[PDB]
Design an enzyme around this catalytic site. Structure first.
Site, mmCIF file in Angstrom:
data_model
loop_
_atom_site.group_PDB
_atom_site.id
_atom_site.type_symbol
_atom_site.label_atom_id
_atom_site.label_comp_id
_atom_site.label_asym_id
_atom_site.label_seq_id
_atom_site.Cartn_x
_atom_site.Cartn_y
_atom_site.Cartn_z
ATOM 1 N N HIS A 54 0.770 -0.970 -0.081
ATOM 2 C CA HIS A 54 0.010 -0.175 0.002
ATOM 3 C C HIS A 54 1.029 1.321 0.009
ATOM 4 C CE1 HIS A 54 -2.408 -2.849 2.277
ATOM 5 N NE2 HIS A 54 -3.526 -2.209 1.765
ATOM 6 N N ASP A 57 2.611 1.689 3.505
ATOM 7 C CA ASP A 57 3.389 0.606 4.089
ATOM 8 C C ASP A 57 4.891 1.099 3.632
ATOM 9 O OD1 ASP A 57 1.278 -1.071 4.620
ATOM 10 O OD2 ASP A 57 1.624 -1.865 2.757
ATOM 11 N N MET A 88 2.001 -6.196 -8.004
ATOM 12 C CA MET A 88 0.757 -5.482 -7.646
ATOM 13 C C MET A 88 0.779 -4.420 -6.482
ATOM 14 S SD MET A 88 -1.777 -5.158 -4.891
ATOM 15 C CE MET A 88 -1.930 -6.704 -4.021
ATOM 16 N N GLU A 181 -11.437 -5.520 -4.740
ATOM 17 C CA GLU A 181 -11.374 -6.683 -3.751
ATOM 18 C C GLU A 181 -12.595 -6.647 -2.898
ATOM 19 O OE1 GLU A 181 -8.011 -6.982 -1.628
ATOM 20 O OE2 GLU A 181 -9.029 -8.165 0.096
ATOM 21 N N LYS A 183 -15.586 -7.413 0.114
ATOM 22 C CA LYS A 183 -15.268 -7.754 1.686
ATOM 23 C C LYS A 183 -16.770 -7.428 2.222
ATOM 24 C CE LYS A 183 -12.785 -7.898 5.920
ATOM 25 N NZ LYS A 183 -11.987 -6.725 6.689
ATOM 26 N N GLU A 217 -10.826 -12.927 -2.127
ATOM 27 C CA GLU A 217 -9.868 -13.165 -1.067
ATOM 28 C C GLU A 217 -10.628 -14.244 -0.194
ATOM 29 O OE1 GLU A 217 -8.144 -10.436 2.262
ATOM 30 O OE2 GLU A 217 -9.092 -12.258 3.443
ATOM 31 N N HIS A 220 -12.828 -13.716 2.731
ATOM 32 C CA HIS A 220 -13.938 -12.376 2.601
ATOM 33 C C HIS A 220 -15.121 -13.302 2.097
ATOM 34 C CE1 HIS A 220 -10.794 -8.758 2.534
ATOM 35 N NE2 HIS A 220 -10.881 -9.791 3.526
ATOM 36 N N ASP A 245 -6.125 -13.198 -3.679
ATOM 37 C CA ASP A 245 -5.667 -13.190 -2.131
ATOM 38 C C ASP A 245 -5.933 -14.309 -1.662
ATOM 39 O OD1 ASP A 245 -4.715 -10.664 -2.335
ATOM 40 O OD2 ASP A 245 -5.833 -9.718 -0.918
ATOM 41 N N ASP A 255 -12.619 -11.036 10.329
ATOM 42 C CA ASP A 255 -11.673 -11.303 9.131
ATOM 43 C C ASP A 255 -10.376 -11.883 9.915
ATOM 44 O OD1 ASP A 255 -10.421 -11.373 6.775
ATOM 45 O OD2 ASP A 255 -9.861 -9.293 6.870
ATOM 46 N N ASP A 257 -7.529 -13.834 8.432
ATOM 47 C CA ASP A 257 -6.507 -13.768 7.677
ATOM 48 C C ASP A 257 -5.384 -14.823 8.109
ATOM 49 O OD1 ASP A 257 -7.284 -11.661 6.204
ATOM 50 O OD2 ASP A 257 -6.233 -10.198 6.997
ATOM 51 N N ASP A 287 -2.422 -12.812 1.555
ATOM 52 C CA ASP A 287 -2.992 -11.692 2.462
ATOM 53 C C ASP A 287 -3.197 -12.393 3.789
ATOM 54 O OD1 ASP A 287 -3.584 -9.436 3.860
ATOM 55 O OD2 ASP A 287 -5.563 -9.252 2.527
HETATM 56 O O1 ARB Z 1 -7.832 -7.212 2.549
HETATM 57 C C1 ARB Z 1 -6.431 -6.339 2.496
HETATM 58 C C2 ARB Z 1 -6.813 -5.111 3.095
HETATM 59 O O2 ARB Z 1 -7.123 -5.171 4.645
HETATM 60 C C3 ARB Z 1 -5.968 -3.992 2.897
HETATM 61 O O3 ARB Z 1 -4.535 -4.335 3.412
HETATM 62 O O4 ARB Z 1 -5.774 -3.491 1.474
HETATM 63 C C4 ARB Z 1 -6.218 -4.829 0.484
HETATM 64 C C5 ARB Z 1 -5.899 -6.102 1.215
HETATM 65 O O5 ARB Z 1 -6.048 -7.113 0.192
#
Ligand code: ARB
Ligand code: ARB
Ligand code: ARB
Ligand code: ARB
Lengths: 388, 388, 388, 388
Positions: A54, A57, A88, A181, A183, A217, A220, A245, A255, A257, A287
């Site tokens: 992200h 991050d 990605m 994505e 959820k 995912e 999800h 994911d 969730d 994970d 993920d």
């Molecule tokens: O689900 C995760 C979400 O929590 C965030 O980290 O951005 C997209 C990822 O796939």
């Protein structure tokens, strides 16, 4: 017998995964922060193919354009030193308090504009690093109460956002695709585009649908009690599985994970069987969050476990499909007939065919067993490595 | 204060609803069978606008073409005697053992052809009776195990079926549309096209998408833990809400089909608010089962309760929206801003706008409360009729 | 490598399991009725140890005392011819319309008295056939609406019933124990004593608690999203695991009754590990329904699959516990410390121990990893037979 | 018409409720920290009766014995200035990383001893402030994987802890009772003592069961899909409802902690009806989180909404029970018969009563309707204030 991953397996991890500090809604962090450079090195050693991120991050929120450059430079050097790729990238439109009511669908117009500019800035970066897919997870798009959000207006705003992103990449001539994505809930009471289905339907209303796909995912869809492999088959059927994911989830609850393989093991088997059978050639992205009970040794053991489980299941699925006894069983259950057109002869022929109605022996057909239980036990035997 | 329904309210009921004998998976029937003619008369007396049916509710399975004619004639006479209409009809492709593995997606090709002929026959009948919508609920399309069904092939077969039905109506010049009714599970372990989202996405892949829409059911989306009003907003946003099934469901468990108003009461309120605000002009159809604890007096009381609850909620929703205090609250929560374009000025202008990023005061924006709780309490007060 | 069951494995099946005709809420039966005598013979051939029954499975409802005798005689002869035992029996207080509002907790007092007499009659029979356990599943005890049942009065009536059954067996000098089987919902909206926990708590309020235990079912606890192995550990901890129903369930939805091994495979592994480790010596009873897609060959394949899966998991669990590497991992995760008393030294010593608070290094303790992920991957490897 | 709360209504709030800063698993805090003294003043102004706290809400973790005294002194002064009471207190055994694997059931023995000392210290404080109940929520007691925790040993350790706390209070002569608060999951994958049922069963195995009860929370039982009012009736039936946590939850998902009245509105109505009908005299405690979308004005509006909704429902429930038409309906549905013993005449009389079996007209009984739907519609009418 050997389940050692190599970069050729296309396994990738988000920086936020092995980097998760363990802070949950009821507890503080149990691990120190990891330098993105260390994560790249450690993952490379484990046999990973690449990483994802992200914007936030990699570049701490609020960073000056110079500090930003320094963070990217160090990151790039680690990639060069290891051979790791970045297939990605995505935007963090959920952590900062400003996004409390959403990013693209926040009620405040000024926040929606800010969310768009923040995304566009990270798209430029993602292309610079070679990413082929840009994921969008609208974690804050939704509501806890009914009057807070007019969903039709929110969907208008969501389409507006995605359409503008499409206009941007095409004007810049970028070779990057988007992947939504879904959820169903958490952190919002109800999230917009809650399942793979809703996401696929929404995509068909965008100006340039060819630029958008989904990033489903495992956990999800399972938070909605849905069959993940089925959802993936629909996405593939529509030509929209741009990325995926992988992780684990134990039913309908928060969730989790968990590492891939954990949670619903059989669903994991059927998923791998499908991805391999269908020839999915994208990254096998994980993920997941190594539980906060673990120290750093536990973090790498969990990451390694993700790839190991995928390799074991891939082996078991291949043996299952290659088994002549299974191939016979599939015929006994008429999977071969399911693949044949119902009426290649056409509507008129079907209407004129008395064997399709007037003289159809409904009782004889009804008496046929489907033999699905024997087939499923063969699948179980293969999964557990108990064939004989 | 008066909640008496009149045919002008467009309330309809399936013959199978008030006609449900009470046979569940663990028990025998608790009520005798109702003559479709008696149900028509009793519902008309209650203020209903019309009825709906499956071919098999009206014409017992296996009926000769003459007995068939006699059943239709008696039915038509009851409609003429009461003024009741038949706005929707559907096919029973789930009860007979021959459909144990599905109708349109059964593995056996001959069953798929039979399912199509059975449907087409009832389409002719539905048009004869004036139905404007034909519903399709694929209750048997799915699986209990992973190898039993290749979902991609099944989706090919599902599209094949719907495409053929489209070719049929258009060739006959019928003015009837189709509406797919999703359900996540039960009676199959997992059902294909499990939610409104999956159904909408699938429709976009049919040859003539304009002929198809959805027939969402309150309880079904709730069996997946989804927000029904949100799902309906998406269907409306796409112009696909052709019909709707109203009832009640208490969370994630077996399909309860409680009378409308029962189950999630607040979701019922938000649903009515949306349908009325959006100007949905289709029938308000009830697909419910009067609990097997009831005798016939209880059956009519339950049916009457469906319409009564809708009328009370309609009143409360109208008062809520018409309340100047609520209108002020909606502005305080920026629902008005959500309805304004994010960037009518265009992409370049957005990129050149420093107020959207470079000089955007993220902290000031973040400090703004959304005032959603006050708004939701006003909604609660209106629902409970406790305003002051 | 050989997973052939023998009567020494204590595997049992209900007559209603392999005998299920396939009638679900949306469909008619797909198989003919099985003669209890044929089921006994077929199960014996598969390696089963015995069978179980509801009064109504063996003696059709309404049978005269003579027809009744004839049904029992034929049944007894089949048991004598095969060596099959009958370790458990139960009453059907759910199928007949008279039990629509319950048996022991029906609002109508006369139905409650009838339910008791029907039960007592089958207890005499069960003892005659050698059953050691009598199961009670209150499938109809509950409600769809809040005012229909005053739960405190219903619990008074439930205790009254069980107390009377206790007074009966003790007066007759029978050597039989009762086992309550919980289920959260279906066929009632909400069932009384919905989980193993509620059942255990209720038992402690009966006059002779020593005569009562629980009969947990895998799928039922999973319909509430609970951890079955955990629930079983609590029942064992309390000395109340008198019997157990094994099957499979895919999450929160209708009661599937899949063959054992299906559904949550990992939970099945942990369950077998616990039952074997704890030395459970009761029957391994299967309460499953061969899917209605199957013919009779599929029914026996499904039944055989139940026992096979248990034997494979038993093998894998044993290898897991016997693995020195796993034993080391268990120590690394301090499972050995969990088994040691927290304060065998007593309260005063604990209060005087400065190492327990004043000088406890909270940071040092917090930094210790639990090593649970490595341990769980070892468990996964063993389950999949992938150790190396 | 007036729903203004007064301290006589016994409404209480945890400091952690209105004090929640909005930090969730995917986002940072959206509000500043509240001084416990300000919360006391603000709640008093709203009509609250008192407050509750965790040791760590009042005394920051790590505080020296002097800073500790200063925090308590300021708090006590605010209580004296407002008249607010402190009826319940609890320990935070979940936030600090040291409790990552639990408090009372952590695998590490030294952490278990530390958890006990931390609790005991806060018990002394709670008594000093006049608390009558001490709540224990084992949020970290549980596991994400099967081998990490031997549940039987964990239950031995849990009982050990509670027994020691019992020995402590009785030796000090304190007049305080304990109340265990169940939760099925979150933050652990599965939490020990997951429902009210499991907690009640466990209590019966403690050395001094009379000192322990339950503290059920609306949302927690609903996270398992259970009927909260039913669970509360069982706790009352057992004489164990020592305290209660009121809030809202929208089905099976993460723990929402919505304001009371939100979530399942009908369940809220039936809960209030039960608490009032049963004469529960304990505090009406709210454990809720004002959504992170709100500013401080929204926080107080949400808190006020909790009490308002309880008062409206109390009014509606009272009117329902006082309605002669409802009283007639209750008789029509035989709620009066449910309250009469099934067999006050005794076992022998029941066995000799031919009207209970031999001559019982099962068909006549089966034909009786229960009239539950009319009764439920009367309840609905009362709830919505639509009687006529
Ligand atoms: O689900 C995760 C979400 O929590 C965030 O980290 O951005 C997209 C990822 O796939
Ligand atoms: O959901 C119901 C289904 O059970 C059947 O009756 O056909 C369509 C209806 O909508
Ligand atoms: O759950 C099953 C129930 O359906 C019935 O068959 O009696 C008890 C069994 O355990
Ligand atoms: O459920 C809450 C828990 O989160 C913590 O705050 O301690 C006990 C409370 O009841």
């Amino acid at each position: 017998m050997n389940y050692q991953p190599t970069p050729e397996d296309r396994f990738t991890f988000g920086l936020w995964t092995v980097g998760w500090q363990g802070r949950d809604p009821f507890g503080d962090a149990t691990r120190r922060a990891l330098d993105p450079v260390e994560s790249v090195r450690r993952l490379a050693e484990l046999g990973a193919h690449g990483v994802t991120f992200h914007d936030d991050d990699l570049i701490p929120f609020g960073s000056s354009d110079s500090e930003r450059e320094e963070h990217v430079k160090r990151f790039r050097q680690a990639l060069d030193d290891t051979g790791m790729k970045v297939p990605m990238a995505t935007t963090n439109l959920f952590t900062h308090p400003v996004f409390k009511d959403g990013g693209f669908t926040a009620n405040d117009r000024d926040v929606r504009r800010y969310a768009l500019r923040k995304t566009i800035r990270n798209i430029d970066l993602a292309v610079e690093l070679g990413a082929e897919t840009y994921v969008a997870w609208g974690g804050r798009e939704g509501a806890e109460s009914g009057g807070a959000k007019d969903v039709r207006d929110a969907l208008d705003r969501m389409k507006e956002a995605f359409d503008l992103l499409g206009e941007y990449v095409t004007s810049q001539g970028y070779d990057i695709r988007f992947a939504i994505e879904p959820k169903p809930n958490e952190p919002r009471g109800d999230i917009l585009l809650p399942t793979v289905g809703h996401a696929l339907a929404f995509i068909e209303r965008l100006e340039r649908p060819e630029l958008y796909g989904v990033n489903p995912e495992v956990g999800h869809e399972q938070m909605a009690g849905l069959n993940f492999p089925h959802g993936i088959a629909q996405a593939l059927w529509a030509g929209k599985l741009f990325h995926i994911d992988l992780n684990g989830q134990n039913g309908i609850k928060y969730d989790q994970d968990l590492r891939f393989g954990a949670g619903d093991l059989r669903a994991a088997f059927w998923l791998v069987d499908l991805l391999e059978s269908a020839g999915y050639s994208g990254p096998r992205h994980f993920d997941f969050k190594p539980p906060r009970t673990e120290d750093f040794d536990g973090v790498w053991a969990s990451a390694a476990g993700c790839m190991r489980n995928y390799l074991i299941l891939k082996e078991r699925a291949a043996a299952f499909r290659a088994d002549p006894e299974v191939q016979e069983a599939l015929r006994a259950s008429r999977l071969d007939e399911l693949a044949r057109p119902t009426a290649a002869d056409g509507l008129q022929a079907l209407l004129d065919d008395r064997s399709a109605f007037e003289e159809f022996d409904v009782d004889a057909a009804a008496a046929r067993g489907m033999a699905f239980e024997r087939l499923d036990q063969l699948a179980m035997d293969h999964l557990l490595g108990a064939r004989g």
